[PDB]
Amino acid sequence: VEKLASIDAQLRLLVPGSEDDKLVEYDALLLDKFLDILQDLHGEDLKEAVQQCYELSAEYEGKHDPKKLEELGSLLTSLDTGDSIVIAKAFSHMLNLANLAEELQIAYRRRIKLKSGDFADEANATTESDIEETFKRLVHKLNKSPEEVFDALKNQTVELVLTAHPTSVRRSLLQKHGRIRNCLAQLYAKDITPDDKQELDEALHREIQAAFRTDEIRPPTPQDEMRAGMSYFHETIWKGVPKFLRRVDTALKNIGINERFPYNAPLIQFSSWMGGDRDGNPRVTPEVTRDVCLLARMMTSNMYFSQIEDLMIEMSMWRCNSELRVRAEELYRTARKHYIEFWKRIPPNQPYRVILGDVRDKLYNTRERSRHLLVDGKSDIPDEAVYTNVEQLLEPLELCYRSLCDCGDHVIADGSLLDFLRQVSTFGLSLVKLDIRQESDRHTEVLDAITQHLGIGSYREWSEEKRQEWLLAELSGKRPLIGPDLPKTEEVKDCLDTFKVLAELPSDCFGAYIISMATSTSDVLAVELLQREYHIKHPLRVVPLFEKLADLEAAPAAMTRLFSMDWYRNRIDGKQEVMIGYSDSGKDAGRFSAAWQLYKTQEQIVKIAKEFGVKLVIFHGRGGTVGRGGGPTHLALLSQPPDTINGSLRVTVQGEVIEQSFGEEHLCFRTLQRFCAATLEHGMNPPISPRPEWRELMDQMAVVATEEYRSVVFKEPRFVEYFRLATPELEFGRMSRPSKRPSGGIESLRAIPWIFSWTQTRFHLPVWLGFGAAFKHAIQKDSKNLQMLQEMYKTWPFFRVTIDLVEMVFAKGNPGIAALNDKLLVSEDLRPFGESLRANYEETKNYLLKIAGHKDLLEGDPYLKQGIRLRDPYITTLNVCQAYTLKRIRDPNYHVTLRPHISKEYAPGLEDTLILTMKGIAAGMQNTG
Amino acid sequence: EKLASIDAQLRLLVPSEDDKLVEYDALLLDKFLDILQDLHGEDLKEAVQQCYELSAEYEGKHDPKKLEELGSLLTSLDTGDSIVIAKAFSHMLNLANLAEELQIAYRRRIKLKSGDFADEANATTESDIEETFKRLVHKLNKSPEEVFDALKNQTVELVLTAHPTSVRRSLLQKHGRIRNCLAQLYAKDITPDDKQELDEALHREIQAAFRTDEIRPPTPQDEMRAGMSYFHETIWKGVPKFLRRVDTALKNIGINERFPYNAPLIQFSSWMGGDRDGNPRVTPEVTRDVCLLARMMTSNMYFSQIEDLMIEMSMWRCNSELRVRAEELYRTAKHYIEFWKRIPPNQPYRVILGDVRDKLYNTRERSRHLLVDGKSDIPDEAVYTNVEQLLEPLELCYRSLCDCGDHVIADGSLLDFLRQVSTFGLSLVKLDIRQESDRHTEVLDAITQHLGIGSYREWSEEKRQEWLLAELSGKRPLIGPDLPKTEEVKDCLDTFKVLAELPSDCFGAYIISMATSTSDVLAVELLQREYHIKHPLRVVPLFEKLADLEAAPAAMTRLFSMDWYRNRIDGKQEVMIGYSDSGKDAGRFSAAWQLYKTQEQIVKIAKEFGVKLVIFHGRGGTVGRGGGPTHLALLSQPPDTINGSLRVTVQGEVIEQSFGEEHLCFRTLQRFCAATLEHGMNPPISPRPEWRELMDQMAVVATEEYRSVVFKEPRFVEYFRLATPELEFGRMRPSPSGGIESLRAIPWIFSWTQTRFHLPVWLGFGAAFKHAIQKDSKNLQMLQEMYKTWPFFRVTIDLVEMVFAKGNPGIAALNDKLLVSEDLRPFGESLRANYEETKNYLLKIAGHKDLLEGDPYLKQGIRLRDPYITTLNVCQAYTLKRIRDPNYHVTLRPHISKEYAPTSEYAPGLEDTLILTMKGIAAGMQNTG
Ligand SMILES: O=P(O)(O)OC[C@H]1O[C@H](O)[C@H](O)[C@@H](O)[C@@H]1O
Ligand SMILES: O=P(O)(O)OC[C@H]1O[C@H](O)[C@H](O)[C@@H](O)[C@@H]1O
């Protein structure tokens, strides 16, 4: 009768339970159904094996008895390659289930009705403010008129830049995840028949299996990796955006604005790095970039195309204004179809349809030109027949729209037509615009080739002042720099060709050219010059990304110098965007010192832009508090230094967060919602400025933290051998892209790998190291600092948000895993070094607690804690499995007695098991640094 | 918990929406087990579970092995442990019945009903009072005024008899508390804490019941003082609630006034201390005492609530009529305390009600002193000797209120109180007297012989009549103080001295058991005259044997022919009938049909002589079933047999179901009132002559079979004495030499109910059905049309069907095997064969595959009780063996119950175990014949 109630009972033990809190039930059902499936497919024997692992991991998660971990080891390590693959798949798959259940729980959790009004409320989905509440706060708590709010909003832009998953999932598998999540959602609805329940049951059972059996063993091209993206948009964002904008409309009613948000106001914009970012990544060629533009153009046209037919059916009206009636007549007159819904000709009896039919053909053509260009390279298709610019596509829709209003039918015009206008206006002809990123040294290499080939010396050898002097001269040069007959290395050709691609393609494909490892004025001019050389008609804006602390300290001088140049001031036309990267900067100096430095740098650069009349946009690269997703993003955005958003947000949406943020319609909606709300609020309601005591203490702690971080990571010569052993970092490095930009050392290692290696291991060093020294030293210098730190946590959003993130990571941390790793993988001489780090973990964690005023991690956030506690047993099993696998890979001569093979049925090795393991853990850990 | 498991194993017994019964039973059982553990130890708890598991397993499959395994267990228990098990199961039953009461109470009514009369056989589909009114008005062209009028003149008298085995006022209230705790545990918006506390409340109250189990006989006085509980508990409040519903129902058909508060719609009566038929414990002094108790307690009830009405009646505006009488009372210038003060005429309603209170108190005290001393120094002036005296001041208040513009207030508690007073009078119940005809003969014979004029016994009926009428107008007494009297004749004569001394509002009817003739009734009239009873009780013949029924019409005709009698009865005669009694003579079937005809004939006869005839339904009817079935049973009565006046026995074994829970109480009252009303305006169809004819034919055959087996077969009584606890019941009222004709009906029915075989209820139906079908296969169709179309027939078959559902021939078989000698077993086998064949014909006629297809809810109720009953049957059977048999002993298990804490009879505790058993079974079986 009842496997489930028991599985529920044994799942409750992990987190004690309440009202709309279904998570444990959800997880229980999913798990119980999943076990049956393992039984059918692989046999009782294996099912038990899987349960045993779970029981052990769970028992471990409760008490934390290192014995349990070893028992688990004995089990996992005794499995042949075949069975371990299966277990690895199993746990890796129960995780994805646990995440769906959590998405669903988060989606339907009840909002708190009366909120404290504290800014802390904005760090949690249940208490944060929706758009209407935000408007109201601004109007009533801040004396802004509705008109002023409406106005702010009309001018606001929010750009979400999508990056590729650092490990990324299949469009099929997504949809199974959706179907499973829906079956589950549906099983919990009252007024549900025994039959429907029975049928939903088998539907659920079936869709889990279908997912489990979609598990083929692999690398994939940038093109496919990107063609991935065009899914999530279909799946959720494409529909999400109109839904949200309609909510904006409703919210404006309720504060007394009697009009809808203009359909062409560019409130929300999307962008991408996929096929764009070539930094330390030679797989991203010019041809790749040409292909992702054409794909983007294609698919977008296709989307507009597959829904136009539905709008056409809906638009059965015959009453129109004359403006339209003319243009319809024209179009019927000029007539004399590959697809089928409307495969016929259409009576001018129904004019809206005539227009939209033309639109459809044009969309189809636009689809086809991009398709042929993509596969052939030529296409015999006139610009006349096709949308080369979004205005061309809006125009007929605006026509219909106006016509409807004029005939007295605005109410109808504000239905699907409006949604469609909003989609077109948000997504344009290219769903995402592509950013280009390359590292400064590359532009230097190119310019050096040029200068040397010209016989004038070596750009590399020149001083900054010289580079600037030369660059400006040539920026007004009266004759080209570059011949066809210039000697080029493959890299230089690759780089130059990227500009040939930028010149050939329509500019509505592209966003910014980001310069990785920027450090100077010359770095930006260099890119400007090459754009001029290739006669790019609408050059992309150049965006320096300042990474290292020193580079951040130098940035203000660099920006000031830029803004001092008339050539440059006039090219940028009042607008500059600068990029920052929390992970990057924190790899240099620790997370703490990087956080603080970035606060100040933004402040200074804002001040500098203000002085020169420049609107400054700060592009948030990965690693922020602001890329967490969920409520915490809400507060993180409000926590930003004053005037740093100023109506224009641009942030990275880290791949490892795209599912949480967008994969479910409600979360999708609220993601969009908070980005828009927070951005709006901030420009009219900055956080308080830090008290000077706080700046002073923060400066003092930064030095100590950076000292500790660098002591351990760069100064200590034992560290890299430790890292290489205690961590799958090397094995990761036989992949996404070369994680060492072969030079050797941590400074050489890229940040994603850095973060990822220590996340696998549950130890998370890159995120907390240096916080402990900083805290300890500040308290030991003066016990009154504890009070100050606490006041800072209570009152200073930046600080709060900074500590919450590190707290969340400790909650996903477990030093026992780190300890097991030492014991299995690390040599006897390095173990005390490990012990030492674990000691620092603990001490850091405890200070962090003392400062937030919590006994236990996440007291402020039981729901998040519950989510984590539930995932853990699964992750733990993967950690352990991983650890022994790493052993067997590294040590050809480690062997133990293998249990006779357990899986039934009715070529793969350790490396395959390790990948499964790396991906399960990564998906269980989501974002950290 | 282990509840879900107990729920799971309870579901198996009966495989939905508001169907909580299984949960209810599960919880109760799980709580009850814990209690057995605490009090008696794991060891015993398991023993109890084992019995339950076995019984349940048995109830599903019906494997005789299970029964034997159970036997081995039960028969291996020492006297100490078997007592405990017997208490346990006997107590789980009472729990199961409370749960069922609760389930029945809250089951949902069907909203659209077929309109068929079958709908009235089930609580979910039967008609409430409003629906009845509406049917009458719309489907039958009666004006609201005509309905209202019918109702105003309608009387419903419920005569309460004593439980044939009866429960304690304390224990009732525990049953109530348990039932409420349970009801409360199932309510949403309920806290973890309230749930926790209700849990322990529940747990506690079960234990308190379980530990209220002392071993004993009790006096008629106490047995009756029992009654005065159920009224307190439920009827006292029930009546006003229902009458208020009548009021609401009258609104909704457009009558704009309330049911008159003094219209005697509902009246109650009792046999307790009244019925002395074959029961010499019921002496004259007993009868005196139950009148005085009744008078006392009733005064007390009025008294304990008056104080609450007085507080409520804080008004000061009154009419003059009242204001005078108040002034008077204050002008004319306290043991208890609520109002222990004097009262300002400032508040006049209170002044009146204070007087009323004192008068009620005095009335209470006089009855109390008379009861314990025999004299009381208390003037009639100080006291209510007549209900009008108590109404008058209430009507005063009532009128005053309406006159001051406060009728709305007057229709609150005051109205309730008026209704109570008017329904219950000064004596909650009126007492009927019953004695058997032969006794009056014995008395008159003593008299005639002492007078020297011969022997009344020897005289012919014509002679008796001639003498009786002469003496009924005699001009001088019959009886001296000097008359020779046996203890019986004195007992009988003293009863009349008691009737003459006590107020007439204490009494109802004098029922003559074993009536047969006109003289039988005149005899009683004469003795009443002799004792100068100022308001003689009406004489009611109870005709029992079939012959006595066939002779009744001639007897009634003769009575109605006598001017002496016609003028004494003043237009009204009541006649009693007794289904069980008559069915003990001739079989249930022939008795049913004969009673249909007798009623018809006697009705006809009364109609001809201008006499309003009331038929007093004694026990055994379809009409004493309680629940919906009663509803249809009443509607099924022959035309004109109710004629505005229903009088029916409420069998003791049905009082709990009918009244113990406020909702069932209300609906019991409801259907009695509704059915009665409807019938006088909407009789059932009259039987088709073919049907009469076939019924007459089947009656002969059925009587033949019944009498063949019971009276003609000389082996029968030895069979009965062995297969049945009948003898042991007979060491209890005396159930002097025997034979079955001698044995009383309750014992007859009860003996075969214990045994789950139920012979008295079905025997003879099988022969009748078989012979009718074998004479002519077209009869089957006729029988089925009768079942479909003729309420009497339907109702008659449903009852027998219900009994088969409570039947189990395996128990009967086990009994034979354990208790009956080898030579009589084939006789048993033969009866079991008849059981089967009868059951199967009965099914074939109702058109059912299985028993109770028409009634899944009832079947569920039975299925759930059964395992408990089965355990008691088995326990019982072996106990009966050990009692009867010197040659039986088996190895006893070492004692199982723990404990911390002479009483000898026949065998050392067996007799006690048997009683427990007899009472558990009886309470699990409720009503059958
Ligand atoms: O961090 P990397 O290893 O350079 O990899 C790529 C990431 O780098 C930076 O930190 C950027 O700020 C992000 O927009 C990007 O996802
Ligand atoms: O023991 P008995 O002869 O049945 O007497 C007791 C019963 O007798 C008759 O059947 C009456 O109709 C009942 O009102 C009463 O309960």
Side-chain angles (χ1 to χ4, degrees), chain B residues 167-185:
Chain B
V167 256
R168 304 194 43 180
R169 186 263 320 245
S170 90
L171 198 66
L172 252 61
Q173 291 185 18
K174 305 199 174 44
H175 291 156
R177 278 187 273 281
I178 297 154
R179 196 183 40 235
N180 304 343
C181 288
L182 185 56
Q184 282 154 63
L185 278 150

mmCIF file of all heavy atoms in Angstrom, chain B residues 167-185:
data_model
loop_
_atom_site.group_PDB
_atom_site.id
_atom_site.type_symbol
_atom_site.label_atom_id
_atom_site.label_comp_id
_atom_site.label_asym_id
_atom_site.label_seq_id
_atom_site.Cartn_x
_atom_site.Cartn_y
_atom_site.Cartn_z
ATOM 1 N N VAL B 167 -27.202 0.791 29.882
ATOM 2 C CA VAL B 167 -25.919 1.440 30.262
ATOM 3 C C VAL B 167 -26.010 2.649 31.206
ATOM 4 O O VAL B 167 -27.041 3.311 31.317
ATOM 5 C CB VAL B 167 -25.011 1.789 29.036
ATOM 6 C CG1 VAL B 167 -23.852 0.786 28.927
ATOM 7 C CG2 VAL B 167 -25.807 1.888 27.727
ATOM 8 N N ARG B 168 -24.879 2.898 31.865
ATOM 9 C CA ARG B 168 -24.729 3.870 32.947
ATOM 10 C C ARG B 168 -24.613 5.325 32.498
ATOM 11 O O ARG B 168 -23.813 5.673 31.600
ATOM 12 C CB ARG B 168 -23.439 3.564 33.713
ATOM 13 C CG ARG B 168 -23.301 2.160 34.294
ATOM 14 C CD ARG B 168 -22.165 2.116 35.307
ATOM 15 N NE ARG B 168 -22.186 3.304 36.187
ATOM 16 C CZ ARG B 168 -21.319 3.531 37.167
ATOM 17 N NH1 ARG B 168 -20.363 2.645 37.448
ATOM 18 N NH2 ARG B 168 -21.437 4.631 37.895
ATOM 19 N N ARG B 169 -25.333 6.185 33.207
ATOM 20 C CA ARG B 169 -25.320 7.629 32.952
ATOM 21 C C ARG B 169 -23.905 8.239 32.875
ATOM 22 O O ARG B 169 -23.665 9.116 32.024
ATOM 23 C CB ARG B 169 -26.168 8.352 34.017
ATOM 24 C CG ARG B 169 -26.376 9.858 33.796
ATOM 25 C CD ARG B 169 -25.402 10.732 34.580
ATOM 26 N NE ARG B 169 -25.175 10.215 35.936
ATOM 27 C CZ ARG B 169 -25.517 10.826 37.073
ATOM 28 N NH1 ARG B 169 -26.090 12.027 37.069
ATOM 29 N NH2 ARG B 169 -25.243 10.232 38.227
ATOM 30 N N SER B 170 -22.984 7.787 33.743
ATOM 31 C CA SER B 170 -21.581 8.204 33.656
ATOM 32 C C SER B 170 -21.040 7.798 32.303
ATOM 33 O O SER B 170 -20.621 8.642 31.499
ATOM 34 C CB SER B 170 -20.732 7.571 34.757
ATOM 35 O OG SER B 170 -20.181 6.324 34.363
ATOM 36 N N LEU B 171 -21.159 6.509 32.009
ATOM 37 C CA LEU B 171 -20.528 5.926 30.822
ATOM 38 C C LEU B 171 -21.067 6.555 29.530
ATOM 39 O O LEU B 171 -20.342 6.748 28.554
ATOM 40 C CB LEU B 171 -20.730 4.405 30.818
ATOM 41 C CG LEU B 171 -19.806 3.600 29.913
ATOM 42 C CD1 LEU B 171 -18.362 3.679 30.381
ATOM 43 C CD2 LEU B 171 -20.281 2.158 29.890
ATOM 44 N N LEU B 172 -22.350 6.879 29.533
ATOM 45 C CA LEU B 172 -22.920 7.610 28.417
ATOM 46 C C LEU B 172 -22.106 8.853 28.148
ATOM 47 O O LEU B 172 -21.639 9.084 27.030
ATOM 48 C CB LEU B 172 -24.376 7.971 28.700
ATOM 49 C CG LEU B 172 -25.357 7.138 27.857
ATOM 50 C CD1 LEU B 172 -25.231 5.639 28.136
ATOM 51 C CD2 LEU B 172 -26.779 7.663 28.069
ATOM 52 N N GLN B 173 -21.891 9.629 29.201
ATOM 53 C CA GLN B 173 -21.264 10.926 29.043
ATOM 54 C C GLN B 173 -19.841 10.786 28.553
ATOM 55 O O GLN B 173 -19.382 11.610 27.750
ATOM 56 C CB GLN B 173 -21.350 11.723 30.343
ATOM 57 C CG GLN B 173 -22.778 12.145 30.647
ATOM 58 C CD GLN B 173 -22.901 13.037 31.865
ATOM 59 O OE1 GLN B 173 -21.921 13.635 32.328
ATOM 60 N NE2 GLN B 173 -24.122 13.140 32.387
ATOM 61 N N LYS B 174 -19.150 9.738 29.002
ATOM 62 C CA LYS B 174 -17.841 9.440 28.436
ATOM 63 C C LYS B 174 -17.999 9.149 26.940
ATOM 64 O O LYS B 174 -17.283 9.715 26.117
ATOM 65 C CB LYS B 174 -17.164 8.291 29.163
ATOM 66 C CG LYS B 174 -17.045 8.519 30.663
ATOM 67 C CD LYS B 174 -15.979 7.632 31.311
ATOM 68 C CE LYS B 174 -15.779 7.982 32.779
ATOM 69 N NZ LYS B 174 -17.057 8.203 33.516
ATOM 70 N N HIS B 175 -18.980 8.327 26.577
ATOM 71 C CA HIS B 175 -19.199 8.059 25.175
ATOM 72 C C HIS B 175 -19.354 9.392 24.418
ATOM 73 O O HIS B 175 -18.680 9.637 23.396
ATOM 74 C CB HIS B 175 -20.370 7.089 24.988
ATOM 75 C CG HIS B 175 -20.079 5.690 25.463
ATOM 76 N ND1 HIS B 175 -21.067 4.807 25.837
ATOM 77 C CD2 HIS B 175 -18.906 5.027 25.633
ATOM 78 C CE1 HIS B 175 -20.520 3.659 26.205
ATOM 79 N NE2 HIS B 175 -19.207 3.769 26.099
ATOM 80 N N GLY B 176 -20.184 10.285 24.956
ATOM 81 C CA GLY B 176 -20.320 11.631 24.392
ATOM 82 C C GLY B 176 -19.001 12.402 24.269
ATOM 83 O O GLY B 176 -18.711 12.968 23.207
ATOM 84 N N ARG B 177 -18.204 12.432 25.346
ATOM 85 C CA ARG B 177 -16.945 13.178 25.348
ATOM 86 C C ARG B 177 -15.993 12.625 24.300
ATOM 87 O O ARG B 177 -15.345 13.386 23.542
ATOM 88 C CB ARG B 177 -16.290 13.156 26.735
ATOM 89 C CG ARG B 177 -16.866 14.191 27.694
ATOM 90 C CD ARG B 177 -16.114 14.295 29.025
ATOM 91 N NE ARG B 177 -16.586 13.340 30.056
ATOM 92 C CZ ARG B 177 -17.689 13.478 30.813
ATOM 93 N NH1 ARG B 177 -18.478 14.544 30.661
ATOM 94 N NH2 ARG B 177 -18.007 12.536 31.726
ATOM 95 N N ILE B 178 -15.938 11.296 24.236
ATOM 96 C CA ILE B 178 -15.113 10.632 23.240
ATOM 97 C C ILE B 178 -15.623 11.004 21.858
ATOM 98 O O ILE B 178 -14.834 11.273 20.955
ATOM 99 C CB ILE B 178 -15.142 9.094 23.331
ATOM 100 C CG1 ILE B 178 -14.589 8.597 24.653
ATOM 101 C CG2 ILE B 178 -14.348 8.454 22.184
ATOM 102 C CD1 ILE B 178 -15.164 7.235 25.005
ATOM 103 N N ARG B 179 -16.930 10.982 21.672
ATOM 104 C CA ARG B 179 -17.440 11.264 20.350
ATOM 105 C C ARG B 179 -17.173 12.715 19.960
ATOM 106 O O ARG B 179 -16.878 13.005 18.803
ATOM 107 C CB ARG B 179 -18.916 10.945 20.278
ATOM 108 C CG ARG B 179 -19.437 10.841 18.853
ATOM 109 C CD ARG B 179 -20.939 10.599 18.852
ATOM 110 N NE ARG B 179 -21.617 11.390 19.883
ATOM 111 C CZ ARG B 179 -22.418 10.895 20.826
ATOM 112 N NH1 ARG B 179 -22.717 9.601 20.886
ATOM 113 N NH2 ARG B 179 -22.961 11.713 21.712
ATOM 114 N N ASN B 180 -17.228 13.627 20.925
ATOM 115 C CA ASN B 180 -16.901 15.015 20.615
ATOM 116 C C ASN B 180 -15.400 15.188 20.326
ATOM 117 O O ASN B 180 -15.028 15.905 19.388
ATOM 118 C CB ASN B 180 -17.314 15.975 21.725
ATOM 119 C CG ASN B 180 -18.783 15.895 22.072
ATOM 120 O OD1 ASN B 180 -19.618 15.368 21.335
ATOM 121 N ND2 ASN B 180 -19.101 16.407 23.236
ATOM 122 N N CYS B 181 -14.533 14.556 21.125
ATOM 123 C CA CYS B 181 -13.096 14.733 20.887
ATOM 124 C C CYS B 181 -12.761 14.368 19.481
ATOM 125 O O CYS B 181 -11.951 15.022 18.813
ATOM 126 C CB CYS B 181 -12.252 13.861 21.804
ATOM 127 S SG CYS B 181 -12.267 14.459 23.480
ATOM 128 N N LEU B 182 -13.387 13.284 19.067
ATOM 129 C CA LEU B 182 -13.175 12.717 17.766
ATOM 130 C C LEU B 182 -13.695 13.674 16.710
ATOM 131 O O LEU B 182 -12.966 14.073 15.798
ATOM 132 C CB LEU B 182 -13.897 11.379 17.695
ATOM 133 C CG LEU B 182 -13.672 10.604 16.424
ATOM 134 C CD1 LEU B 182 -12.188 10.379 16.177
ATOM 135 C CD2 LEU B 182 -14.429 9.295 16.548
ATOM 136 N N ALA B 183 -14.948 14.082 16.861
ATOM 137 C CA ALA B 183 -15.504 15.110 15.980
ATOM 138 C C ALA B 183 -14.586 16.339 15.855
ATOM 139 O O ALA B 183 -14.431 16.887 14.788
ATOM 140 C CB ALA B 183 -16.896 15.527 16.450
ATOM 141 N N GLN B 184 -13.946 16.735 16.941
ATOM 142 C CA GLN B 184 -13.124 17.935 16.919
ATOM 143 C C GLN B 184 -11.771 17.739 16.272
ATOM 144 O O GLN B 184 -11.230 18.667 15.694
ATOM 145 C CB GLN B 184 -12.950 18.498 18.323
ATOM 146 C CG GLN B 184 -14.178 19.264 18.779
ATOM 147 C CD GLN B 184 -14.303 19.291 20.278
ATOM 148 O OE1 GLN B 184 -13.445 19.833 20.990
ATOM 149 N NE2 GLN B 184 -15.369 18.681 20.777
ATOM 150 N N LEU B 185 -11.203 16.556 16.393
ATOM 151 C CA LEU B 185 -9.906 16.308 15.801
ATOM 152 C C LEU B 185 -9.959 16.510 14.298
ATOM 153 O O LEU B 185 -8.926 16.777 13.671
ATOM 154 C CB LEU B 185 -9.477 14.889 16.109
ATOM 155 C CG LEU B 185 -8.863 14.721 17.484
ATOM 156 C CD1 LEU B 185 -9.131 13.326 18.009
ATOM 157 C CD2 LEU B 185 -7.364 14.992 17.377
#
